[PDB]
Amino acid sequence: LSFELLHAPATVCGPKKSTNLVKNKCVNFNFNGLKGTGVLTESNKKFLPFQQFGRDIADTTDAVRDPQTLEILDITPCSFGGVSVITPGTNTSNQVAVLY
Amino acid sequence: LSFELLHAPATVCGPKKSTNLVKNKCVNFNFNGLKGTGVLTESNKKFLPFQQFGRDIADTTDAVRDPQTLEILDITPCSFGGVSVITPGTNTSNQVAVLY
Amino acid sequence: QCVNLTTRTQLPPAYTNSFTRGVYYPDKVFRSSVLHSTQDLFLPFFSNVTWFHVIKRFDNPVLPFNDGVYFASIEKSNIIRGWIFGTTLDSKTQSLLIVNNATNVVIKVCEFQFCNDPFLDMESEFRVYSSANNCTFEYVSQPFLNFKNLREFVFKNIDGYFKIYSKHTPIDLPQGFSALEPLVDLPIGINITRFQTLLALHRSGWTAGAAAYYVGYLQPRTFLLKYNENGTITDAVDCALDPLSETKCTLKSFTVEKGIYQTSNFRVQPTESIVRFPNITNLCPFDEVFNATRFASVYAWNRKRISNCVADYSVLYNLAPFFTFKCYGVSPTKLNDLCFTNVYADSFVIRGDEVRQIAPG
Amino acid sequence: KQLSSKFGAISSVLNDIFSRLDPPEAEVQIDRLITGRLQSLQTYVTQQL
Numbered sequence A, B: 001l002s003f004e005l006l007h008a009p010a011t012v013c014g015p016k017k018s019t020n021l022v023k024n025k026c027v028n029f030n031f032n033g034l035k036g037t038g039v040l041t042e043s044n045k046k047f048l049p050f051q052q053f054g055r056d057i058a059d060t061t062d063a064v065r066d067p068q069t070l071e072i073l074d075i076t077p078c079s080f081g082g083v084s085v086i087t088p089g090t091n092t093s094n095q096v097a098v099l100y
Numbered sequence C: 001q002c003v004n005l006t007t008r009t010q011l012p013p014a015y016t017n018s019f020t021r022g023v024y025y026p027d028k029v030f031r032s033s034v035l036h037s038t039q040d041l042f043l044p045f046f047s048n049v050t051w052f053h054v055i056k057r058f059d060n061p062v063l064p065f066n067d068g069v070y071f072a073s074i075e076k077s078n079i080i081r082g083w084i085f086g087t088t089l090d091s092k093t094q095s096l097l098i099v100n101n102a103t104n105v106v107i108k109v110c111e112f113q114f115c116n117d118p119f120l121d122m123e124s125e126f127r128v129y130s131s132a133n134n135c136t137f138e139y140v141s142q143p144f145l146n147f148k149n150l151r152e153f154v155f156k157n158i159d160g161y162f163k164i165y166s167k168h169t170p171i172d173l174p175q176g177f178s179a180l181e182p183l184v185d186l187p188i189g190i191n192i193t194r195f196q197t198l199l200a201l202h203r204s205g206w207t208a209g210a211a212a213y214y215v216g217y218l219q220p221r222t223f224l225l226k227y228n229e230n231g232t233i234t235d236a237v238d239c240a241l242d243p244l245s246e247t248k249c250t251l252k253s254f255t256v257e258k259g260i261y262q263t264s265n266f267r268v269q270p271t272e273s274i275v276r277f278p279n280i281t282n283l284c285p286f287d288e289v290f291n292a293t294r295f296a297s298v299y300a301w302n303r304k305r306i307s308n309c310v311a312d313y314s315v316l317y318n319l320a321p322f323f324t325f326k327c328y329g330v331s332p333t334k335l336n337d338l339c340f341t342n343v344y345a346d347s348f349v350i351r352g353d354e355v356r357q358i359a360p361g
Numbered sequence D: 001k002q003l004s005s006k007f008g009a010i011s012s013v014l015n016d017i018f019s020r021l022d023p024p025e026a027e028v029q030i031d032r033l034i035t036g037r038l039q040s041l042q043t044y045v046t047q048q049l
């Protein structure tokens, strides 16, 4: 068996769910054999009919075309960041602060 | 006579422990699988009975207890280090000095 | 011989805290005046644990656990005697049994037949099992033993090793720190998914004294432990409990200086799948190249393009009706999860001498 | 842009390697990708210093 895998719009998937779009939920997914994790929101991009998936500067997927629905379903525009802790010395007190 | 290979934790093994010990010399000892070189020296520290081998800041076996004898031996490396040569120019003379 | 209990009074279990309990030596490494952080099954601080009280209250619960049960109990007059460990607590599977009479402890694992309500009863009555059929293990060690004594026990099962951590101190859980040193390691190498607590009754029908024990859950996390100059554990730090101990674990020091510090990052964990590709109206006819009435030769094979369908790879990977299945450039475990456009199936017959040649290069 | 570098691996996407390769070779490819990214980040850190 020779797989033309992730070089064209794929059609052979065993299990699927075909869940509708949902906002503010940066969670995992799997689009045509490509896995990601992010929210699924709208966009104002006018995609040409032949175009299927877009790519950014970093060659990371940021757009997709869903068959039988023909919608955007943007790829991983979800929030992320780091957490910082601010506290004085242990000899004075032990109170802490949480900063994002 | 029949045996079983790869089916349970193994306890039946042949004698590979070199049948003798070393004091006041750095040798390549093999303490139940781990290989290290150092002088077996008596330690004044107190070791709890469950402890088998200790570790230094370098996460290396600097302390160990004998698998049979309850005595504890410290691992100290023998004489090692860089050596430098102090010499004048070759046009003047050829006398050299050794320094560790 | 087992006797059922009828006088039990119904009462839901209570919950207590785990302020400074559940610490133990992760290994047998001696350290002198250094702070070390390690990954091991450790009980989180300020975690809720189940409290059982025995007085006319009888508490003999059965709960499924994989490994890592922290057993702490305030004890007087040696009410607690034995423990039960196993998978189904019957003769069909091997079960671990701990007993301790007035002379010494006995550690035995066997396919013992366990009744519904096993317990203990001058003590001369021993009614916890009926027969032994498939076992040969035996081990004998020294005996381990108003509230006056506190006993804490930790049982773990990693890589087939049964580690027992015990600590006895004279005295809810008291506010203090006590590192639980390991007691004995048992090389059993079996599975255990159930446990049962055994109690001793006093005859003077039967009377039970005042006793209480705690059951805790062990979780995999990183603890920053301190080893003094004499090797004993003094304090413990949980790297994911509060931001103060997080800063302590990140800086590898028990004291943090005044200022702004960075420890980790905030992320949103996945919860549900929004995979967006409606399924194809037909299935992939994989039997066309497998159950064909005739096959082609190696030099001129038959290529059947299978596309626009839904495949099932359980007959190839999960099930093995064929002699040898192997995948080089794709994962055989996740064959069903992937999505490809088309596959070109080449069917041909090769003698057993040259079947190794079907590989890249 | 260095995230798109293949670094001698089959693909430049991590999940593609995880799902599209058996674990004995998947761990080799993942190790190669992470050590290439570590070398790139070391170069970036040296330039920033």
Ligand SMILES: *[C@@H]1O[C@H](CO)[C@@H](O)[C@H](O)[C@H]1NC(C)=O
Pocket: B044, B045, B046, C229, C230
């Ligand atoms: C530590 O152990 C040594 C002997 O190994 C002993 O002399 C010393 O008193 C101990 N430290 C303390 C604080 O007791």
Ligand SMILES: *[C@@H]1O[C@H](CO)[C@@H](O)[C@H](O)[C@H]1NC(C)=O
Pocket: C015, C047, C048, C049
């Ligand atoms: C007590 O345990 C329950 C679960 O058994 C948990 O929901 C609850 O938060 C715990 N109590 C505290 C104070 O953490």
Ligand SMILES: *[C@@H]1O[C@H](CO)[C@@H](O)[C@H](O)[C@H]1NC(C)=O
Pocket: C101, C102, C103, C104, C106
């Ligand atoms: C305690 O149990 C052991 C287990 O074999 C037994 O040998 C011993 O005789 C028992 N002691 C008493 C006093 O019954």
Ligand SMILES: *[C@@H]1O[C@H](CO)[C@@H](O)[C@H](O)[C@H]1NC(C)=O
Pocket: C092, C133, C134, C135, C136
């Ligand atoms: C019966 O015992 C033997 C030896 O202890 C063991 O090999 C065998 O698996 C046991 N049978 C069952 C059904 O547990």
Ligand SMILES: *[C@@H]1O[C@H](CO)[C@@H](O)[C@H](O)[C@H]1NC(C)=O
Pocket: C087, C190, C191, C192, C193
């Ligand atoms: C865990 O116990 C179950 C109970 O039957 C058993 O089937 C399984 O093999 C055990 N796991 C291991 C790794 O032995």
Ligand SMILES: *[C@@H]1O[C@H](CO)[C@@H](O)[C@H](O)[C@H]1NC(C)=O
Pocket: C279, C280, C281, C282, C283, C310
């Ligand atoms: C595909 O989905 C439909 C429902 O839309 C279902 O009836 C059918 O059994 C599924 N299987 C196929 C044909 O792939």
Ligand SMILES: *[C@@H]1O[C@H](CO)[C@@H](O)[C@H](O)[C@H]1NC(C)=O
Pocket: C287, C288, C290, C291
């Ligand atoms: C061929 O063999 C497969 C597997 O045993 C079976 O499912 C199928 O019904 C058979 N016949 C055809 C026409 O595929």
